[PDB]
Amino acid sequence: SKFCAMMDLLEEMQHRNRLKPNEESWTWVMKECVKSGQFRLGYCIQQVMETECKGCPADLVKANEANAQKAKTEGKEHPGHLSQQAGLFDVKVE
């Protein structure tokens, strides 16, 4: 996963090197989230840039929302097996 690698790299930079990520670093992360279609990570990064940095590139925020609404139309908002109704004795504990 590209997102995991970059986040770990940022963790190393801020914690084990004492360097504050700038706007450029977060923009790269947001671009990766948009490119990969992971629209839920984009929301979290969007708030991070709106909190630490000054806002988010509005181009990327709109792109993420478009991906999210595509999932709603296609129904891939959450993994389906989660939506399946279960019960006390209807759950398979591997």
Binding site: E74, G75, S83, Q85
Partner: protein
Amino acid sequence: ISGVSPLLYFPPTTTSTTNREDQINKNTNIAIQMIKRYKGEVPPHYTRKSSATIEQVEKEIDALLGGAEKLRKTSTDDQPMDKLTLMERCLRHALWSYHKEEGRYDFDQIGRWVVYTPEDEVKLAQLKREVEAKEKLAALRKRREEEGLPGGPVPRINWPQEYSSFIDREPVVAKRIRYDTLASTTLERDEKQIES
């Protein structure tokens, strides 16, 4: 897949002329046959003791309950109920049960007036998911028709990997035959006849 196979796999399409209408017609006939066997013999015809429409009954109920609005009283769940409240509950329960059986599903009203027991609430939740799922499936099956993509489901498979994995060709070829046939067949029944 060790061993040079004698033939290259090709799609099993041999019934070139397969109209969607015929496939759905056959599905409808099979669906009707299974339904007839499952349900039972169609119940004996029963003559109504009176003639009246559902809309007329609902209007009469609304008129009856409208005149007592000023008299009608406010109560908690654990407090005892009044005559007006009891009449309203019974009438609305019957009305919305009839509507649910007929198919005019208003899940909010059904939830308020027909749902009194925990088990019944569970059943309502089961119904709510099914209707939404069917609506989504029909919409995408129609949009997939607009896309022109294979109506039937297609598994997420990489046959080049399967070819490598399997020692013998025969099971691999058979699997492709089934899925190719499945992806080429529409799994729909005419809902007009089903409702009828």
